[PDB]
């Protein structure tokens, strides 16, 4: 019943690690996209105000 | 606080310097390890004549300077140009005065005795730091992953290493060095991507092949039936938009680049690859310590960040190791700074104070003192 | 060694599930932020071109 | 209770120490008889500099220390290192303070008069025990099997002995010592197993050959037509799984190792073997006592534990002894601790109190007192 319990444990630990890893990568890709989005929104509002004033 | 705040950690690499204060979670300063020397006389608007350039100003202005790398394969090769990178680190990057900060530095795996004495000579005699300490890089990486025995596969910009460590002592005779790393890897992608029918013609095309390698490259497990997959042409492909519109597509080569780390034969290298080398390090160590090393393969370095590197290595050494063995490949997320973080921890530690080499030790014992 | 292997298996399966759940939530928050970022970038480029033309 | 609880029994061996409280059924403490001295300066994490290591910490850390064995062939050869093993036994292993516990110690068969006086000098003058007593090892083994006359074949890690005992007095002129024991026996298996086409290369391979010897080795009766049996290749073979998967098979050699105890010629020894030596001891004794010794061959010691040792010895001496004689080979199950158990019994006994050498006897008579 053991080689079975240990094998299931190892496969679920492997799965666990793969998912935990896929996550540091998606949550990190994030701080990056959310920061890029805010940076662009602020560049947008600035140029929207400058177009009003040149118009 | 005197030095709790005050300890500096400088990790000198072949491609990047990582620097900051012991205590922080990540390097305050990261920048290329170059020193540019202007090919012509002249000035930028508003500045004076500059004899030299370091880090990013050397990279940005590379067209008018002759660029030089002080650290070849992890070892300091030019000491005039290294003292220049240190100067830049303290005074411009961290903006600290060095003469009131203890400095933890790092060196490479089988760093020649004479070098560890020379950077001590320059730290104490030209920068006048209060105290300093040189840690071995794999050893800080291991320790930053909590443990004290394990084997580190360390891979950055100019070198790859395997450093088996037992209760803190890195094992000299079992360490392996493979001179193929992220630098070699960007240049190989370059060719398989021009070979895909492309042109990285201007310098704004060159530089970004490296950003393609970092963002889109993969280490597939079963690299065999991944090429096979490439052919049926699934939605495996991946297009990147260049500085301009010029949408370049990379489907397949995406993983042909990190398969170079397992097959050096992709690049005319006759040396063995990462996984075999992990293993050979291990069958060069004492017998009784080999179960420990196998359950503690810690990975560190920019080039070990390719996703699925750990799964491929997992299966690469399970299938070479005796089945009675437990394999375990630890690859943390912050691994591009493991080395640095291990230094930050150690140097901010409560017990490390008694290993700092002080100017008292030095002025009295000569460079020999820190050399150990 | 068993009650130990099974207990470690159960705790790692629990951990695995918690992380897999935290992820559907962060990858989903994402398609949303990345889509918002692209929508704003296109509003930005449009107004940047119109300010150029009024200037 | 004062000392009913309080009597200690320490059996000092060439390979193992066995220790505990008189009264118990088995030793509370069993550990190697080594004293490790670090080859280099340094520390384990969290500990201080250690000058010395004893028992299992010396074995576990053997790669950085020079290991030394205080007892060569049952006799104490280094008294600085023995006082170290005793210190460890009292203070760390049994965690008792010695100055309030009577201590029964053991010595070897023809232990030099001067040694029995020296360990008494160290027991009373550096450990300050209330009282002590030195029993001869074969004599405690016999007694633990109930009787008082018999001949003990005693075999441990560095020595084998035959000690004919009559109404308690071990017979000096009939005692035989054969310097080939379990230590010699593990190293011979080692070679017949590498010779089977193997490699005990790392220290985790070395150590376990000894665990193969203990678990799988046999003493076959009719070792002649057991080799013959090996050849027809029956299901006589036996595979052991190593620290990892590496399933090693041992069919035959399994018994070629204890056949060394009857044939010393297997190992370049010219001495006679166990059974002949049992016998020779016996035809060196008085005539009238030889029927007694023959019906009371008591076996003790780790190396006499090989199954079928008793049957081979049974038939080995029947066929050398006059047919008018009764042969009887007693081999109890607890025999790896006979010596110790005999001491536990004796020292917890109601009548032994009047043989304890007290500090009163010593401070008044000199080491001579206990020497007898």
Swiss-Prot record, chains A, C:
Organism: Oryctolagus cuniculus (Rabbit)
Domain notes: The molecule is in a coiled coil structure that is formed by 2 polypeptide chains. The sequence exhibits a prominent seven-residues periodicity.
Residues of the full protein shown: 175 to 229 of 284
Top-rank taxon: Eukaryota
Quaternary assembly: Homodimer. Heterodimer of an alpha (TPM1, TPM3 or TPM4) and a beta (TPM2) chain. Interacts with HRG (via the HRR domain); the interaction contributes to the antiangiogenic properties of the histidine/proline-rich region (HRR) of HRG. Interacts (via N-terminus) with LMOD2 (via N-terminus) and TMOD1 (via N-terminus).
Protein name: Tropomyosin alpha-1 chain
Subcellular localization: Cytoplasm, Cytoskeleton
Family: Belongs to the tropomyosin family.
Residues with the Phosphoserine modification: 12, 32
Membrane spanning stretches: none
Function: Binds to actin filaments in muscle and non-muscle cells. Plays a central role, in association with the troponin complex, in the calcium dependent regulation of vertebrate striated muscle contraction. Smooth muscle contraction is regulated by interaction with caldesmon. In non-muscle cells is implicated in stabilizing cytoskeleton actin filaments.
UniProtKB/Swiss-Prot annotation, chains B, D:
Highest taxon listed in the record's lineage: Eukaryota
Enzyme class: hydrolase
Gene Ontology biological process terms, A to Z: actin filament bundle assembly; actin filament polymerization; mesenchyme migration; positive regulation of gene expression; skeletal muscle fiber development; skeletal muscle thin filament assembly
EC number(s) per entry: 3.6.4.-
In-chain residues carrying the UniProt-annotated modification Methionine (R)-sulfoxide: 44, 47
ADP-ribosylarginine modifications at: 177
GO MF term set: actin monomer binding; ATP binding; calcium ion binding; calcium-dependent protein binding; cytoskeletal motor activator activity; hydrolase activity; identical protein binding; magnesium ion binding
Record-linked Pfam families: Actin
Something else known: In vertebrates 3 main groups of actin isoforms, alpha, beta and gamma have been identified. The alpha actins are found in muscle tissues and are a major constituent of the contractile apparatus. The beta and gamma actins coexist in most cell types as components of the cytoskeleton and as mediators of internal cell motility.
Name this protein carries in UniProt: Actin, alpha skeletal muscle
Gene: ACTA1
